[PDB]
Design a protein around this ligand. Structure first.
Ligand SMILES: COc1ccc(S(=O)(=O)N(CC(N)=O)c2ccc(N(CC(N)=O)S(=O)(=O)c3ccc(NC(=O)CCN4CCOCC4)cc3)c3ccccc23)cc1
Length: 281
């Protein structure tokens, strides 16, 4: 009935078609219409109550944008991006979807494009300073942040900031830890970077960046270490969904209370998966 946490796609042995929704009010899961094409490594977002699945890898790298309407339980195709973008990052500014980075085969994108729902059109914006796949994306104060990822040579702890009015990117303070495939979100005016892969291990560490003091501080780590996790914010708490811990595909969903600096496991997906697109509406 209320706002749900949607997880689309993912990987477990193969790319998946599942669209499921979690109700944090009563702990229930709903099963919704499958995606047209199974996809992992995509990103989710919500604009005008519509859920969007962006990019990923098919079953093969995907330029697709698909739109799910919760009121009709239907997926519809949208204008494709100018390039396939697997392991994409996505952020929304003023009802516009920014597709950041990602990979096409062995090409590691630094390009960025902007989708206009009112026109069903994508347009390129200024490219990032760094090529980033597995990049975490966060929107804060009408700025778009691109955090960590892999540039094709090094895994990254750097982060950079896009200025829509200036159409430009600037590097910001780097993270304490290198992170590709982290969950990045915004909670209570800070950017959170949860988990990821530092080049040797999946991580359970979690650091937040305070823009005022422009520094990254560690906070309480998660129970299960994980990369390629889904992440979202619901009612002032962070939810991370699934992922890969180095051996298993997680079905675990942990929830972070910023006021207690605590991670509790609050439910479990119907099956373990990583590389899901996650959004709330
Ligand atoms: C420890 O090694 C790692 C090194 C680095 C990383 S990463 O997080 O930093 N990273 C970015 C980067 N590499 O730069 C990523 C890798 C893979 C992704 N997936 C989708 C996609 N299109 O790539 S995925 O989640 O769905 C997945 C698919 C297969 C496998 N591995 C298997 O063996 C599958 C075979 N299984 C099948 C069932 O069981 C038996 C064996 C594990 C995960 C990512 C998705 C989003 C963001 C980042 C992703 C992660 C792990």
């Amino acid at each position: 009935v209320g706002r749900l946490i949607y997880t689309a796609g993912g990987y477990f042995r193969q790319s998946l078609s599942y669209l499921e929704a979690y109700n944090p009010s009563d702990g229930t899961w709903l099963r919704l219409a499958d995606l047209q094409v199974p996809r992992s490594g995509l990103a989710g977002c919500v604009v005008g109550g519509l859920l969007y699945a962006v990019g990923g890898r098919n079953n093969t790298d995907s330029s697709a944008l698909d739109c799910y309407n919760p009121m009709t339980n239907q997926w519809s195709p949208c204008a494709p991006m100018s390039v396939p973008r697997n392991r994409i990052g996505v952020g929304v500014i003023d009802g516009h979807i920014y597709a950041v980075g990602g990979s096409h085969g062995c090409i590691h994108h630094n390009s960025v494009e902007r989708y206009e729902p009112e026109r069903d059109e994508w347009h390129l914006v200024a490219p990032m300073l760094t090529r980033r796949i597995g990049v975490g994306v966060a929107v804060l104060n009408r700025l778009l942040y691109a955090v960590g990822g892999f540039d094709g040579t090094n895994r990254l702890n750097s982060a950079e900031c896009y200025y829509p009015e200036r159409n430009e990117w600037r590097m910001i303070t780097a993270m304490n830890t290198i992170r590709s495939g982290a969950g990045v979100c915004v909670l209570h005016n800070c950017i959170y970077a949860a988990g990821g892969y530092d080049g040797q291990d999946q991580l359970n560490s979690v650091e937040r960046y305070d823009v005022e003091t422009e520094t990254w501080t560690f906070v309480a780590p998660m129970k299960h270490r994980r990369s390629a996790l889904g992440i979202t914010v619901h009612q002032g708490r962070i939810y991370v969904l699934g992922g890969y811990d180095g051996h298993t595909f997680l079905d675990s969903v942990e929830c972070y209370d910023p006021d207690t600096d605590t991670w509790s496991e609050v439910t479990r997906m119907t099956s373990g998966r990583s590389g899901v697109g996650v959004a709330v509406t």
